[PDB]
Amino acid sequence: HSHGLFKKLGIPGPTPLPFLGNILSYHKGFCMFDMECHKKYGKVWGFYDGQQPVLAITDPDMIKTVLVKECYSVFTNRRPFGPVGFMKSAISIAEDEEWKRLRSLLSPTFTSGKLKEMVPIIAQYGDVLVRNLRREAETGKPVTLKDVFGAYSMDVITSTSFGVNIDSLNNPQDPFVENTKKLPFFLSITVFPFLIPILEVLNICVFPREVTNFLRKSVKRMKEDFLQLMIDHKALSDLELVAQSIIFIFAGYETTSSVLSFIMYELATHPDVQQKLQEEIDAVLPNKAPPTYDTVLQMEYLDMVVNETLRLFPIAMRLERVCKKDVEINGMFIPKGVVVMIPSYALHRDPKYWTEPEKFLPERFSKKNKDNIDPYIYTPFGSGPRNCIGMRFALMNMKLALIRVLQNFSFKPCKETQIPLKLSLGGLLQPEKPVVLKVESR
Amino acid sequence: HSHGLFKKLGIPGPTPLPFLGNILSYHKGFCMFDMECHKKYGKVWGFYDGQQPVLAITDPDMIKTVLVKECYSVFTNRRPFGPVGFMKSAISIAEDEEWKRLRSLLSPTFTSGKLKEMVPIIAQYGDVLVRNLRREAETGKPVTLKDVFGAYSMDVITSTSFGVNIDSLNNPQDPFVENTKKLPFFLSITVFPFLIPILEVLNICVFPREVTNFLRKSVKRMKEDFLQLMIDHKALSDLELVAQSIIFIFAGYETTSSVLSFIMYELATHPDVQQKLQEEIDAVLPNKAPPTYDTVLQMEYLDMVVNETLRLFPIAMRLERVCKKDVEINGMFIPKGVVVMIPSYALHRDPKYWTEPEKFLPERFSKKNKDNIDPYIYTPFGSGPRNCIGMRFALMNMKLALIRVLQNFSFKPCKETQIPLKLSLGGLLQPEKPVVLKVESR
Numbered sequence A, B: 001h002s003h004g005l006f007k008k009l010g011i012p013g014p015t016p017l018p019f020l021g022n023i024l025s026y027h028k029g030f031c032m033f034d035m036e037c038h039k040k041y042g043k044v045w046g047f048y049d050g051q052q053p054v055l056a057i058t059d060p061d062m063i064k065t066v067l068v069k070e071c072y073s074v075f076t077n078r079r080p081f082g083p084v085g086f087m088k089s090a091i092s093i094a095e096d097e098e099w100k101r102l103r104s105l106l107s108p109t110f111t112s113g114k115l116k117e118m119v120p121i122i123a124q125y126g127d128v129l130v131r132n133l134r135r136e137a138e139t140g141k142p143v144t145l146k147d148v149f150g151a152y153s154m155d156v157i158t159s160t161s162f163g164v165n166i167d168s169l170n171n172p173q174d175p176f177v178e179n180t181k182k183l184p185f186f187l188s189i190t191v192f193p194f195l196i197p198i199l200e201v202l203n204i205c206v207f208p209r210e211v212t213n214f215l216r217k218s219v220k221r222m223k224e225d226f227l228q229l230m231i232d233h234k235a236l237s238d239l240e241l242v243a244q245s246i247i248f249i250f251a252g253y254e255t256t257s258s259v260l261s262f263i264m265y266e267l268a269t270h271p272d273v274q275q276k277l278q279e280e281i282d283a284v285l286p287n288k289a290p291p292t293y294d295t296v297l298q299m300e301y302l303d304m305v306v307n308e309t310l311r312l313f314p315i316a317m318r319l320e321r322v323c324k325k326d327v328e329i330n331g332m333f334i335p336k337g338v339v340v341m342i343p344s345y346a347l348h349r350d351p352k353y354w355t356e357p358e359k360f361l362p363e364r365f366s367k368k369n370k371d372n373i374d375p376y377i378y379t380p381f382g383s384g385p386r387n388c389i390g391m392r393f394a395l396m397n398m399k400l401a402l403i404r405v406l407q408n409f410s411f412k413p414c415k416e417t418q419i420p421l422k423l424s425l426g427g428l429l430q431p432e433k434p435v436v437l438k439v440e441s442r
Ligand code: HEM
Pocket: A067, A091, A092, A093, A103, A247, A248, A249, A251, A252, A255, A256, A259, A310, A314, A315, A316, A319, A320, A379, A380, A381, A382, A383, A384, A385, A386, A387, A388, A389, A390, A391, A393, A394, A395
């Protein structure tokens, strides 16, 4: 029974229930649970995911110790979760020297240079995006952003990772769109993690095996974008190749479509921001010119908008590292096996660092005020050697979509639209109700 | 499915069955399974304990790489087994830096110096041993060695680890003898290791919890022999103290009584060895003199006898290390998570290194022939930084018993006695039928 651990270390925290730990307190969302705990306990506090002790830390210096300085030595790995199957080879799930190998093997794939060659191809789908939107916009009818954005981000990730060029909203039949489209239980495997090994020997996997096979076969026909870069330490393997691609599609799809939805909601409810953004796009790109790599990096306000949205909606919600060994960081003892958690969502809406945390104010990120922003408070992409390897790609992909979408259209709230936007209470950062706006042509 | 692993590495081995792996081949004893595999596959071979791949290695240079050179870096830990509970803190079960701490904290307790202070107290029980034996011997009746030896080794371990002086064969009521005396399922948790975490969260433990409590309480009344040495890196803890003692009693009891039984069986079936041993004891210790520390270390033949018995009956049977990371030792790749196993029993009865391996011949260990004996073939106490920490104590304890027993008695086979001795087919090196001999007074 490890439920005495925090009270044995003098660390405050909500009293756990037996077996359950604190998970019942997730009933309002664990983001709301983190903020509440931050408010009532201060800088450090402990709670239990079933029998798993989790130490929340909010000190910026502690966060850097954990994310940067002591990462290879102590805090290398995320929380084991599963059942996972062959996806244990995925970089985001791999541990210690295996993760190190995959990070070293995958780093050159996510440089500025490979992104600059990807901008022309991902631009092709900005243009389909505008057409499908123009259609759903000419309907005069409120549009579901997650359906045109979910089609776009889909369209992008497949061609950048396998070169397959499809319009998911209009060729909804290509087996590659089919397979890729397919991708309550979480609640249970946190209070019953002793059951993960059972699901593992039963071939049970949270990733649909029905699909996975399709991919490993699609890789072999390509064996003679992301796939080539990997095909072209010790070298990667065939099945390893597939696990990494699967992680990329998940990352490319649900993050991008969700964030874009969040962006457009903020732009619709702040018309002045939307206009100012469009004026910047129109000045850098006269007469609806084609977005390019070098152009995107000149749009400061566009950058300020994405950053402030990511402040309000950091889709990772929490960063986590498992403590591999007894250690004493910044003046407190962390025992082996505790999960150290950085509550980014709560840190991004903390009044200690943010005046009016709940308002959407891109100027917090202006060249004037950006300097006052602590990189271990504001961590939408994490930090240290295990940060979001696709951060530059994600921002380019979102920005290229935003540019082309705003060059052609404006976004107003509908009688439908949920204002204020509410967040889903699940385990993913997404709107409760889908975002829908009036889209007018410029 | 990891059942293709060995055939994927080019490593021969018996074809596994699904889920079961090779465990059905344990039906004749896994010692017999190791010898058979050694005979049909050669120096290296792989098999599966359910889904756990095990690589058997017999090359002396490979064995040293695994046991000595690469121990801290790769092969630090034994196979996880359980459910274990608080006994995960026991040194023999602990892993990586925790094991390192306990090994460093326990090493000074097992020196020559602490043994020399223990010889007088453990001598007191050689004398009870002779009395209870004399009684069971004056019965004229065949004697069950494991009952007088099991009482002695019991009597020794309790006073050397808690100072409690009892005659287990005649004060069979003292709560300390009671509790300590109390200490099919193995078959199941090797083909269902995915069930160990379940038994863990159910407080289920292979070590009777009914007992364990008694001990941790007996430690606190002593908190104000082994216990003091520990009470008297980072310092040890109270519960940690108890887990280590429990390991010592298991080690002190079943190893010593079993080996002594094996010894006396060999001495009874080789009267010339027994006599020659008694002549040595009588010359070093005239007129049934008291065995002492310095005296024991002068009895070369006594030493040769124990060593040859340990060759025939190495109670550990196998040494094991888990491979912590992909490595390539002595010209072959070992993947992470494989259990590397040294089949000591089979290596001790291999004709490559042993002329007439099945005969009991103490002269193999004579100062003449001892030099030709490879320390990575003959490994009754293992090797490297994780070897048997109580080896010197075990040999002294056995030898002091043997000396006093042979000074007073001789041991002949009975109509009962099982000749040839057969080995139990369980998971412990012990006689099938208990050893019983005629014991005559000298
Ligand atoms: C707005 C979009 C995205 C955001 C906000 C985001 C954020 C994050 C965060 C916060 C982490 C954990 C970092 C940490 O623990 O310190 C992470 C990990 C990761 N991200 Fe992203 N991500 C995004 C999109 C992407 C995309 C599009 C890809 C690839 C196509 C990607 C690839 C990864 C990988 C592979 C990891 C695990 C890295 C490792 O363990 O070495 N991400 N991301």
